Amino acid sequence: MSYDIQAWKKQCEELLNLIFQCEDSEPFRQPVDLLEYPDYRDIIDTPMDFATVRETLEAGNYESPMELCKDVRLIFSNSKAYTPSKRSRIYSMSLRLSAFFEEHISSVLSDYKSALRFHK
Ligand SMILES: CN1Cc2ccccc2NC1=O
């Protein structure tokens, strides 16, 4: 529905489903195993992954698509910080998937901002 301040929830659930089904999301689908990778927390202050984002959305624990978008962007900025080399296939996967995410989220954000303006 036009001007729906709830539309983002279904739009983000659908977008997360597309990301999970994309091969480029494979490294980012679950929390980094901090026992397997003991220097991860030396580099990364705030781990994030797509299963955490999907679970938080399904629980109703995001107030706005901005809060969801901040967590997704943290998945990609964490990957850049831990895996900074342009040579890494993991760097390439996060670049491709981040660009996909940013192309799809822009209209979710602008629709929300318009709905919120309407609601006020
Ligand atoms: C999500 N990760 C975790 C990881 C584990 C092992 C090797 C590289 C990476 N890089 C990432 O960006």
mmCIF file of N, CA and C in Angstrom, residues 23-64:
data_model
loop_
_atom_site.group_PDB
_atom_site.id
_atom_site.type_symbol
_atom_site.label_atom_id
_atom_site.label_comp_id
_atom_site.label_asym_id
_atom_site.label_seq_id
_atom_site.Cartn_x
_atom_site.Cartn_y
_atom_site.Cartn_z
ATOM 1 N N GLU A 23 24.935 -16.623 -3.839
ATOM 2 C CA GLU A 23 26.207 -17.309 -3.482
ATOM 3 C C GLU A 23 27.115 -16.306 -2.758
ATOM 4 N N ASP A 24 27.013 -15.023 -3.097
ATOM 5 C CA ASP A 24 27.958 -14.003 -2.553
ATOM 6 C C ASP A 24 27.725 -13.789 -1.049
ATOM 7 N N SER A 25 26.623 -14.276 -0.488
ATOM 8 C CA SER A 25 26.357 -14.087 0.966
ATOM 9 C C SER A 25 26.985 -15.186 1.823
ATOM 10 N N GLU A 26 27.474 -16.258 1.202
ATOM 11 C CA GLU A 26 27.895 -17.466 1.941
ATOM 12 C C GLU A 26 28.747 -17.112 3.163
ATOM 13 N N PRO A 27 29.830 -16.277 3.084
ATOM 14 C CA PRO A 27 30.683 -16.032 4.262
ATOM 15 C C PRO A 27 30.030 -15.262 5.419
ATOM 16 N N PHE A 28 28.873 -14.677 5.134
ATOM 17 C CA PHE A 28 28.230 -13.644 5.980
ATOM 18 C C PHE A 28 26.895 -14.141 6.524
ATOM 19 N N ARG A 29 26.560 -15.416 6.309
ATOM 20 C CA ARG A 29 25.215 -15.909 6.651
ATOM 21 C C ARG A 29 25.102 -16.239 8.121
ATOM 22 N N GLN A 30 26.205 -16.533 8.793
ATOM 23 C CA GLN A 30 26.194 -16.897 10.232
ATOM 24 C C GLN A 30 27.292 -16.151 10.961
ATOM 25 N N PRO A 31 27.187 -16.051 12.299
ATOM 26 C CA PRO A 31 28.237 -15.432 13.096
ATOM 27 C C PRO A 31 29.609 -16.065 12.840
ATOM 28 N N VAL A 32 30.614 -15.218 12.721
ATOM 29 C CA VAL A 32 32.020 -15.701 12.691
ATOM 30 C C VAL A 32 32.261 -16.482 13.989
ATOM 31 N N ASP A 33 32.813 -17.692 13.864
ATOM 32 C CA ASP A 33 33.164 -18.578 14.998
ATOM 33 C C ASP A 33 34.425 -18.018 15.664
ATOM 34 N N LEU A 34 34.263 -17.425 16.851
ATOM 35 C CA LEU A 34 35.332 -16.662 17.539
ATOM 36 C C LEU A 34 36.350 -17.644 18.129
ATOM 37 N N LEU A 35 36.001 -18.933 18.309
ATOM 38 C CA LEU A 35 37.006 -19.970 18.692
ATOM 39 C C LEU A 35 37.820 -20.380 17.462
ATOM 40 N N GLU A 36 37.148 -20.554 16.332
ATOM 41 C CA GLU A 36 37.840 -20.912 15.080
ATOM 42 C C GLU A 36 38.780 -19.763 14.738
ATOM 43 N N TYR A 37 38.324 -18.509 14.887
ATOM 44 C CA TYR A 37 39.092 -17.306 14.454
ATOM 45 C C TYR A 37 39.384 -16.413 15.656
ATOM 46 N N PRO A 38 40.402 -16.742 16.462
ATOM 47 C CA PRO A 38 40.618 -16.032 17.718
ATOM 48 C C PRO A 38 41.142 -14.591 17.585
ATOM 49 N N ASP A 39 41.613 -14.156 16.416
ATOM 50 C CA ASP A 39 41.966 -12.717 16.304
ATOM 51 C C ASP A 39 40.795 -11.883 15.764
ATOM 52 N N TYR A 40 39.634 -12.483 15.499
ATOM 53 C CA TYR A 40 38.531 -11.725 14.868
ATOM 54 C C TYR A 40 38.175 -10.518 15.760
ATOM 55 N N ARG A 41 37.968 -10.763 17.045
ATOM 56 C CA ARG A 41 37.540 -9.713 18.001
ATOM 57 C C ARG A 41 38.681 -8.732 18.271
ATOM 58 N N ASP A 42 39.916 -9.078 17.933
ATOM 59 C CA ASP A 42 41.031 -8.096 18.036
ATOM 60 C C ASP A 42 40.826 -6.978 17.011
ATOM 61 N N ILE A 43 40.186 -7.305 15.889
ATOM 62 C CA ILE A 43 39.980 -6.364 14.749
ATOM 63 C C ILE A 43 38.569 -5.766 14.785
ATOM 64 N N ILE A 44 37.580 -6.584 15.133
ATOM 65 C CA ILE A 44 36.144 -6.232 14.968
ATOM 66 C C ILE A 44 35.499 -6.033 16.350
ATOM 67 N N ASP A 45 34.951 -4.844 16.546
ATOM 68 C CA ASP A 45 34.319 -4.446 17.819
ATOM 69 C C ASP A 45 32.929 -5.067 17.897
ATOM 70 N N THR A 46 32.206 -5.055 16.781
ATOM 71 C CA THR A 46 30.775 -5.411 16.774
ATOM 72 C C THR A 46 30.487 -6.377 15.640
ATOM 73 N N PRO A 47 30.644 -7.697 15.870
ATOM 74 C CA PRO A 47 30.316 -8.666 14.841
ATOM 75 C C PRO A 47 28.856 -8.525 14.397
ATOM 76 N N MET A 48 28.610 -8.840 13.133
ATOM 77 C CA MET A 48 27.231 -8.922 12.604
ATOM 78 C C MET A 48 27.193 -9.927 11.466
ATOM 79 N N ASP A 49 26.019 -10.497 11.251
ATOM 80 C CA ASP A 49 25.821 -11.475 10.167
ATOM 81 C C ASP A 49 24.342 -11.480 9.762
ATOM 82 N N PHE A 50 24.054 -12.083 8.621
ATOM 83 C CA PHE A 50 22.683 -12.019 8.079
ATOM 84 C C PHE A 50 21.712 -12.841 8.930
ATOM 85 N N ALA A 51 22.118 -13.948 9.561
ATOM 86 C CA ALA A 51 21.100 -14.688 10.345
ATOM 87 C C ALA A 51 20.643 -13.843 11.539
ATOM 88 N N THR A 52 21.563 -13.127 12.163
ATOM 89 C CA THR A 52 21.253 -12.208 13.267
ATOM 90 C C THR A 52 20.289 -11.125 12.763
ATOM 91 N N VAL A 53 20.576 -10.529 11.615
ATOM 92 C CA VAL A 53 19.676 -9.471 11.086
ATOM 93 C C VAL A 53 18.295 -10.086 10.832
ATOM 94 N N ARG A 54 18.244 -11.215 10.136
ATOM 95 C CA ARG A 54 16.922 -11.820 9.838
ATOM 96 C C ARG A 54 16.148 -12.120 11.136
ATOM 97 N N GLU A 55 16.805 -12.692 12.141
ATOM 98 C CA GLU A 55 16.167 -13.060 13.437
ATOM 99 C C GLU A 55 15.673 -11.779 14.131
ATOM 100 N N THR A 56 16.463 -10.711 14.128
ATOM 101 C CA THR A 56 16.088 -9.451 14.801
ATOM 102 C C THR A 56 14.834 -8.889 14.107
ATOM 103 N N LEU A 57 14.822 -8.900 12.777
ATOM 104 C CA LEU A 57 13.638 -8.416 12.030
ATOM 105 C C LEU A 57 12.431 -9.293 12.366
ATOM 106 N N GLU A 58 12.605 -10.612 12.350
ATOM 107 C CA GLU A 58 11.418 -11.495 12.540
ATOM 108 C C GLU A 58 10.843 -11.305 13.959
ATOM 109 N N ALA A 59 11.702 -11.020 14.926
ATOM 110 C CA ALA A 59 11.339 -10.789 16.345
ATOM 111 C C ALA A 59 10.637 -9.435 16.529
ATOM 112 N N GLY A 60 10.727 -8.539 15.558
ATOM 113 C CA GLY A 60 10.129 -7.197 15.692
ATOM 114 C C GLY A 60 11.045 -6.249 16.429
ATOM 115 N N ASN A 61 12.344 -6.535 16.459
ATOM 116 C CA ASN A 61 13.298 -5.789 17.312
ATOM 117 C C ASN A 61 13.982 -4.654 16.537
ATOM 118 N N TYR A 62 13.656 -4.445 15.253
ATOM 119 C CA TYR A 62 14.068 -3.210 14.531
ATOM 120 C C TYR A 62 12.913 -2.204 14.536
ATOM 121 N N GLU A 63 13.236 -0.968 14.898
ATOM 122 C CA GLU A 63 12.236 0.106 14.983
ATOM 123 C C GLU A 63 11.965 0.685 13.606
ATOM 124 N N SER A 64 12.950 0.595 12.711
ATOM 125 C CA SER A 64 12.913 1.308 11.410
ATOM 126 C C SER A 64 13.828 0.560 10.456
#
